[PDB]
Design a protein around this ligand. Structure first.
Ligand SMILES: [Ca+2]
Length: 124
């Protein structure tokens, strides 16, 4: 499932904590969502959830394959530098290229300390 995604975000994140802090926070972290964020660390959930939108469409391994979120792929690191298993294929490549920007961009964004299990009649 989404679980070698936690393996993923240790790799890309010098300093900041994954899911344990991250997955609760900010306004728009299902599929679609759009107000804006709150701070832009709901904005790194924006890009991985709208790349996972293009995964429900996806012609390479197509979704009668119901949810291929890790039983299929793992990844490479290590600046951040997250990618994929380095042969990188068609659909092993696509779902690891959404789950890359996920991992990287929790190191790219201004974090929610604040929206951290959120408010929003407020931020969005
Ligand atoms: Ca969303």
């Amino acid at each position: 499932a989404l679980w070698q995604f936690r393996s993923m975000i240790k790799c890309a994140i010098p300093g900041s904590h994954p899911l344990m802090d991250f997955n609760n926070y900010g306004c728009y972290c299902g599929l679609g969502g759009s107000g804006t964020p709150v701070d832009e660390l709901d904005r790194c959930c924006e890009t991985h959830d709208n790349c996972y939108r293009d995964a429900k469409n996806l012609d390479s391994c197509k979704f009668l394959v119901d949810n291929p979120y890790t039983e299929s792929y793992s990844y490479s690191c290590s600046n951040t530098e997250i990618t994929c298993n380095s042969k990188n294929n068609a659909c092993e490549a696509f779902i690891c290229n959404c789950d890359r920007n996920a991992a990287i961009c929790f190191s790219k964004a201004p974090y929610n300390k604040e929206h951290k299990n959120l408010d929003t009649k407020k931020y969005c």
